[PDB]
Design a protein around this ligand. Sequence first.
Ligand SMILES: OC[C@H]1O[C@@H](Sc2cccc(Cl)c2)[C@H](O)[C@@H](n2cc(-c3cc(F)c(F)c(F)c3)nn2)[C@H]1O
Ligand SMILES: [Cl-]
Ligand SMILES: [Cl-]
Ligand SMILES: [Cl-]
Ligand SMILES: [Cl-]
Length: 138
Amino acid sequence: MLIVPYNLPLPGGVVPRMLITILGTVKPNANRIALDFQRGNDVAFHFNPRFNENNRRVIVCNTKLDNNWGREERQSVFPFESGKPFKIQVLVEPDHFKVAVNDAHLLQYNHRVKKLNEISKLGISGDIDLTSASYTMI
Ligand SMILES: OC[C@H]1O[C@@H](Sc2cccc(Cl)c2)[C@H](O)[C@@H](n2cc(-c3cc(F)c(F)c(F)c3)nn2)[C@H]1O
Ligand SMILES: [Cl-]
Ligand SMILES: [Cl-]
Ligand SMILES: [Cl-]
Ligand SMILES: [Cl-]
């Protein structure tokens, strides 16, 4: 379906009520996936499933400013499975990105990058077959 890494333009950046939906399948023996909501070279929101970080599965979220990664936000819930189809929904709310996987809420990430309308690309990378990536306003 789509070539990874895939770039989805976000025209005029993001705004509350914007919903991004990603459909794909995790490859066998996946190691990593990443979503990168980019403001130029900066990464406003990096969402990064790691399948084998010291034999644990964890989602790492962070922001990259002037080429430097900030303080990571980790929680324990890991809804992805090697080999299986998934849906990721990222809903922009006024104070955070809200993420649900497979229709179940996963996590929130508070806005560190304040200029939402300059967050103008979403990169999708890692160990998936990517079916589709799109957005709508709810
Ligand atoms: O905090 C989050 C960051 O963690 C560092 S490690 C680190 C080093 C120094 C300081 C800090 Cl705070 C962290 C990683 O190197 C970063 N990273 C992952 C990817 C990547 C690329 C791909 F192509 C993928 F497919 C993929 F899934 C992921 N690109 N950059 C990022 O995850
Ligand atoms: Cl493509
Ligand atoms: Cl951008
Ligand atoms: Cl804005
Ligand atoms: Cl990739």
